[PDB]
Amino acid sequence: KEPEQLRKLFIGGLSFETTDESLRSHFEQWGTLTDCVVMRDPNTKRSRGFGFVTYATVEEVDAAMNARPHKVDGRVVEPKRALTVKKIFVGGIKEDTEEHHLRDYFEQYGKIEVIEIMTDRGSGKKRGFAFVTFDDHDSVDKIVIQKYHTVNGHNCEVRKAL
Numbered sequence: 637k638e639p640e641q642l643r644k645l646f647i648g649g650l651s652f653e654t655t656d657e658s659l660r661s662h663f664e665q666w667g668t669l670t671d672c673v674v675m676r677d678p679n680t681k682r683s684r685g686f687g688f689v690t691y692a693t694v695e696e697v698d699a700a701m702n703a704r705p706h707k708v709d710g711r712v713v714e715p716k717r718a719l720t721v722k723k724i725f726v727g728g729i730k731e732d733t734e735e736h737h738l739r740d741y742f743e744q745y746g747k748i749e750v751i752e753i754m755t756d757r758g759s760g761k762k763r764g765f766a767f768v769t770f771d772d773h774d775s776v777d778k779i780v781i782q783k784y785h786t787v788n789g790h791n792c793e794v795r796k797a798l
């Protein structure tokens with residue numbers, strides 16, 4: 637079983653009338669839920685407007701994220717995997733890595749809007765790193781939890797870029 641942390645979706649922006657049961661019935665459309673909680677005040681029991689769900693598998697998390705936007709009990713909510721940005725730094729690509737290497741690999745994580753292969757300001761030579769900007773943060777979130785990224789035969793360092 638994948639680590640539980642990687643099977644969780646944290647759901648912001650809930651309707652205050654959403655319950656454990658209604659949040660569960662909604663997100664069970666995209667997989668088996670082993671846990672589903674609406675956060676509430678300990679004294680008033682009034683919703684805090686957010687919660688989380690835990691799927692049985694990471695593929696189920698993916699399915700839920702691919703089904704965004706989610707309207708739950710009449711309100712569009714904001715699910716996120718376990719710093720919300722749309723851009724990554726990709727290091728270690730050396731001088732022989734081109735746009736199409738980066739595109740063919742990273743397009744399978746999300747929709748790419750910008751690829752920027754970095755060159756030396758003085759010489760024009762490639763510096764061996766790049767930035768990739770996507771249309772949505774979940775691509776980056778999937779990317780940076782991987783232990784490894786292999787592109788053009790290179791083991792790359794990938795992190796969020798601000």
Ligand SMILES: CC(=O)NCCc1c[nH]c2ccc(F)cc12
Pocket residue numbers: 646647673674675686687688
């Ligand atoms: C952004 C924020 O502060 N809350 C959402 C993320 C989060 C952190 N710890 C939790 C515990 C329970 C839960 F339902 C959600 C969370």
